[PDB]
Design a protein around this motif. Sequence first.
Motif, PDB file in Angstrom:
ATOM      1  N   UNK A   1      66.461  14.190  55.723  1.00  0.00           N
ATOM      2  CA  UNK A   1      67.393  13.358  54.969  1.00  0.00           C
ATOM      3  C   UNK A   1      67.918  14.088  53.739  1.00  0.00           C
ATOM      4  N   UNK A   2      67.021  14.691  52.957  1.00  0.00           N
ATOM      5  CA  UNK A   2      67.440  15.303  51.701  1.00  0.00           C
ATOM      6  C   UNK A   2      68.271  16.556  51.942  1.00  0.00           C
ATOM      7  N   UNK A   3      67.892  17.365  52.933  1.00  0.00           N
ATOM      8  CA  UNK A   3      68.648  18.581  53.214  1.00  0.00           C
ATOM      9  C   UNK A   3      70.086  18.254  53.593  1.00  0.00           C
ATOM     10  N   UNK A   4      70.279  17.237  54.435  1.00  0.00           N
ATOM     11  CA  UNK A   4      71.629  16.842  54.813  1.00  0.00           C
ATOM     12  C   UNK A   4      72.355  16.176  53.649  1.00  0.00           C
ATOM     13  N   UNK A   5      71.636  15.383  52.853  1.00  0.00           N
ATOM     14  CA  UNK A   5      72.275  14.692  51.745  1.00  0.00           C
ATOM     15  C   UNK A   5      72.805  15.642  50.688  1.00  0.00           C
ATOM     16  N   UNK A   6      72.042  16.692  50.377  1.00  0.00           N
ATOM     17  CA  UNK A   6      72.500  17.660  49.385  1.00  0.00           C
ATOM     18  C   UNK A   6      73.804  18.315  49.819  1.00  0.00           C
ATOM     19  N   UNK A   7      73.900  18.702  51.092  1.00  0.00           N
ATOM     20  CA  UNK A   7      75.127  19.314  51.587  1.00  0.00           C
ATOM     21  C   UNK A   7      76.271  18.308  51.625  1.00  0.00           C
ATOM     22  N   UNK A   8      75.989  17.073  52.047  1.00  0.00           N
ATOM     23  CA  UNK A   8      77.048  16.079  52.183  1.00  0.00           C
ATOM     24  C   UNK A   8      77.639  15.702  50.831  1.00  0.00           C
ATOM     25  N   UNK A   9      76.795  15.548  49.809  1.00  0.00           N
ATOM     26  CA  UNK A   9      77.295  15.177  48.490  1.00  0.00           C
ATOM     27  C   UNK A   9      78.217  16.238  47.908  1.00  0.00           C
ATOM     28  N   UNK A  10      78.079  17.494  48.337  1.00  0.00           N
ATOM     29  CA  UNK A  10      78.991  18.534  47.873  1.00  0.00           C
ATOM     30  C   UNK A  10      80.360  18.405  48.526  1.00  0.00           C
ATOM     31  N   UNK A  11      80.425  17.798  49.710  1.00  0.00           N
ATOM     32  CA  UNK A  11      81.689  17.605  50.423  1.00  0.00           C
ATOM     33  C   UNK A  11      82.260  16.279  49.927  1.00  0.00           C
ATOM     34  N   UNK A  12      83.016  16.343  48.834  1.00  0.00           N
ATOM     35  CA  UNK A  12      83.589  15.141  48.246  1.00  0.00           C
ATOM     36  C   UNK A  12      84.815  15.522  47.432  1.00  0.00           C
ATOM     37  N   UNK A  13      85.634  14.516  47.138  1.00  0.00           N
ATOM     38  CA  UNK A  13      86.835  14.680  46.329  1.00  0.00           C
ATOM     39  C   UNK A  13      86.520  14.269  44.897  1.00  0.00           C
ATOM     40  N   UNK A  14      86.774  15.169  43.954  1.00  0.00           N
ATOM     41  CA  UNK A  14      86.504  14.937  42.544  1.00  0.00           C
ATOM     42  C   UNK A  14      87.815  14.716  41.794  1.00  0.00           C
ATOM     43  N   UNK A  15      87.698  14.551  40.474  1.00  0.00           N
ATOM     44  CA  UNK A  15      88.873  14.322  39.640  1.00  0.00           C
ATOM     45  C   UNK A  15      89.786  15.540  39.568  1.00  0.00           C
ATOM     46  N   UNK A  16      89.304  16.717  39.966  1.00  0.00           N
ATOM     47  CA  UNK A  16      90.113  17.929  39.926  1.00  0.00           C
ATOM     48  C   UNK A  16      90.956  18.098  41.186  1.00  0.00           C
ATOM     49  N   UNK A  17      90.340  17.951  42.355  1.00  0.00           N
ATOM     50  CA  UNK A  17      91.051  18.073  43.611  1.00  0.00           C
ATOM     51  C   UNK A  17      90.479  17.160  44.673  1.00  0.00           C
ATOM     52  N   UNK A  18      90.968  17.282  45.904  1.00  0.00           N
ATOM     53  CA  UNK A  18      90.518  16.440  47.002  1.00  0.00           C
ATOM     54  C   UNK A  18      90.246  17.287  48.234  1.00  0.00           C
ATOM     55  N   UNK A  19      89.181  16.925  48.945  1.00  0.00           N
ATOM     56  CA  UNK A  19      88.792  17.560  50.195  1.00  0.00           C
ATOM     57  C   UNK A  19      88.795  16.482  51.267  1.00  0.00           C
ATOM     58  N   UNK A  20      89.614  16.674  52.292  1.00  0.00           N
ATOM     59  CA  UNK A  20      89.640  15.783  53.452  1.00  0.00           C
ATOM     60  C   UNK A  20      88.759  16.427  54.515  1.00  0.00           C
ATOM     61  N   UNK A  21      87.515  15.960  54.611  1.00  0.00           N
ATOM     62  CA  UNK A  21      86.539  16.585  55.495  1.00  0.00           C
ATOM     63  C   UNK A  21      86.487  15.854  56.830  1.00  0.00           C
ATOM     64  N   UNK A  22      86.577  16.615  57.916  1.00  0.00           N
ATOM     65  CA  UNK A  22      86.394  16.127  59.279  1.00  0.00           C
ATOM     66  C   UNK A  22      85.193  16.866  59.855  1.00  0.00           C
ATOM     67  N   UNK A  23      84.161  16.125  60.252  1.00  0.00           N
ATOM     68  CA  UNK A  23      82.921  16.707  60.748  1.00  0.00           C
ATOM     69  C   UNK A  23      82.680  16.203  62.162  1.00  0.00           C
TER      70      UNK A  23
END
Lengths: 50, 146, 130, 486, 165
Positions: free
Chosen positions: C52-74
């Motif tokens: 759970x934690x290993x996947x969660x750490x990677x997933x939380x990095x794949x996100x859109x912040x106030x600087x830019x946006x990432x449209x992730x398709x997995x």
Amino acid sequence: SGKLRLYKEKLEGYNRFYSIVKTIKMVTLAKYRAAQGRIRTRDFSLRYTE
Amino acid sequence: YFMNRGRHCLCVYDDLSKQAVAYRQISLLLRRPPGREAYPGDVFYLHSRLLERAAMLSPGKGGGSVTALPIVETLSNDVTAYIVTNVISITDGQIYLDTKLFTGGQRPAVNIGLSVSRVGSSAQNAAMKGVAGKLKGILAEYRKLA
Amino acid sequence: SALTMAEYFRDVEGQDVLLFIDNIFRFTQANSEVSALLGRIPAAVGYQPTLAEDLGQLQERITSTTKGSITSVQAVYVPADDITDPAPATTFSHLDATTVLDRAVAESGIYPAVNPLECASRIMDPDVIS
Amino acid sequence: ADHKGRVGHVSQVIGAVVDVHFADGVPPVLTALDVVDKLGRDEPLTLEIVQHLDAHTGRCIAMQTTDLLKLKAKVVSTGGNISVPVGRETLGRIFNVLGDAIDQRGPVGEKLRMPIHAVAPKLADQAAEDAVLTTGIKVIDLILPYCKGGKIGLFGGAGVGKTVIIMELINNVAKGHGGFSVFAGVGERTREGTDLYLEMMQSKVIDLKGESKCVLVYGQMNEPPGARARVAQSALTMAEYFRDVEGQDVLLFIDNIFRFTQANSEVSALLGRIPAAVGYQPTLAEDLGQLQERITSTTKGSITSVQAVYVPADDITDPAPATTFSHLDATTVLDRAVAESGIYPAVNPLECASRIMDPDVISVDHYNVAQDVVQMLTKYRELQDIIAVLGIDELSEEDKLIVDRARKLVKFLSQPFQVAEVFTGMTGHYVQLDDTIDSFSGLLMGTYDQVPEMAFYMVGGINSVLEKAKKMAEEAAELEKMRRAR
Amino acid sequence: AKKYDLFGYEVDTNTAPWIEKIKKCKYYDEAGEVLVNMNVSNCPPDIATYNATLQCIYQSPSKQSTPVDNESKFCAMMDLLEEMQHRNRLKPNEESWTWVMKECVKSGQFRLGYCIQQVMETECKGCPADLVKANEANAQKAKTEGKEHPGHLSQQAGLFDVKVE
């Protein structure tokens, strides 16, 4: 696992089948009783037909 | 804090399913005897001592209370899981949500058939209790006829 | 590595970047393969205890912040079509739109073999869409 | 005895498992140890020796939380196993595994204590012959009679008046047999424990200002698994005192017996033992044997245990219920459908079972009447199905009489309990065993074919039926006379 | 004389100091704190304590020093009455309903005044004449201005004229 869920789905399908067949039984019994009235009114039309 | 001062609190856990996984990870990484589904032997004790802290104090201790609303996720409507069974055996009833009802239009998709409240009418207002006394019977008869 | 490149494009360049990952399940599989030799007791099914934690750490990095946006398709692989498997089951909570494919639909000649009764979207609300 | 006050030091702490090192040698297994260092704890800490690691180190299971526990912490042996107060001073009080009054109602003031772990009665102490336990309830006494020293499996969760039946049994056993009762809550919800205590105080089975006839020993869920695995044994020791010293027919309620198995399984898992199939401890059979075997009818007295059984996942073949059923002598099943029909106690007569249903144990007349009632109920179910298919008028003359008699029997199996006098407002009935046999035998023959059906509803004995029939007839006559006037 | 709780433990029946404390509160929300404090001290409120709380609610400037959205004195007093009636088994007397009626007439809510008047007639055996006259005066004042009900309710709306937002 999958096999456990397979049996669960199979049992659910059998339950659905049982419910449908029970409804069929009720419907058929309704017409059995509804057209059971003939028994009182039969056995007299065919007298000279004999 | 509010319970011990004659006030009422409502605690929501979203969700205990992940806490069990975290505790299992901690136990396994520390070399503790695993149990069913690799969970340690203290998972039931963990959840029980968590939920048992939600109570309704007597009038001699202020009359405060804590209402617990733990949330649990079932896989393919499998309520036979280790954690799900443990949480069900501890809480005072359950509110089961059905996927078919949710997709069918019923929202909230409360499955009244599988839902239960062990407290009963004692947790209802006078007017609500009066209405429910007949509503429950009407709904039961409607389900039987359907 | 790919997520680091995407994060740089998001932050420094301030651009809107697309991130296609195929397959995200292999990351979990590789971690599980190496976990046994790291002296970790296997968890249920046989994945590493830190699934759970290993996947969660990677997933939380794949996100859109106030600087830019990432449209992730997995693309998520469901072993033996067992959607209840811990690896597929742990990824549902890390997504905004889940597309669940069914083998039964595909066998009937319907493509894409999407099972609409099992999919979900976060923006399926009157406030977001018309 | 020689190890009273022996000093030891904590050597390892892994969760609820604590290892204590003794310079003079570990005390005997199952010995209670006290942690003298209460530096920051809000409760005393006590450890139970479960294993010996070497000649000086011993593994233990903590009965409370092991927080703020340092290594090399001083520990003092108590001189033996856990000790629990036993006597007539424990009636109407709430205890825990350690035998401490948790009701905040003053000191217990006991005169003696007994160890928690006691060997089961020897083969020479067993009762000469099986005997029936007259509970005062028509359904139980007739169809599924209880046996002294036997174990009864009480199925059916909440919503079927399970607590009411328990309170009625507690009252009736003391009223008729003059024996006390002990209630053990194993892994029970604390809210339900409070509700049961309030109900008992309201029904006067626990009279604060008078004499109580029940002891409460509660091991709650929030407590560690080390306590939920010994609360039942503490209650059993309390019952054994009354059985032996006073020679009585005691009752022992366990709620539930599945929680006991779960607690023992958790304790075994903590020790690191390999679980058996499904995942229960390898000593599952032995754990239940060491407890059930202590519940029997000896030459001095008896202990009849009514244990509430829970079937996990509705699987009757699961090792826990499967192993439990090997020790049960009877089975009382409670159904919601029966309760919804207005029948109390909500007991399904055709779903229950008992092993003493044999002429070699019960009287021949009792067995014949019980079998006749069961046969009539089964035939009534068949006739109910038939009429639901075809109709009532299609039944033959014999079938109509069978249906009427069976309906009277179903209405006649209900009974008002004295415990419910305050709520229901109607006096309860305590029906004698012979009275029930005679009443049912007369009803089956057809002597009471003229009494109205409703005369059997919520009544005790046959005299009550006659009185209710007379009152109904008088009321009907008065109503008809009033109608004629207007 | 002595009273006991549900578990049979004697409680404290000296509520006089707590009534005095309630009479000192300025904002009626603080009066709720006194009830909680005396509950913890094993001194259950009496009928006099609830009457004092109702008087404080009627006579207080507002719920708190800072304004609170949708605050209502009538709702708080009715909730207190429900508490003492259902969860304490204390029957409100004429004084409690008198305070409720006084608040209703003072706030201009002349319809809740009608309901409280009916309640007092059915239970209290009579409502004070002054309160009824004041409530009728408020109703007439509202009627003359035409503000019997909110304006948006009296506007005709067809099947497709209802804006559900």
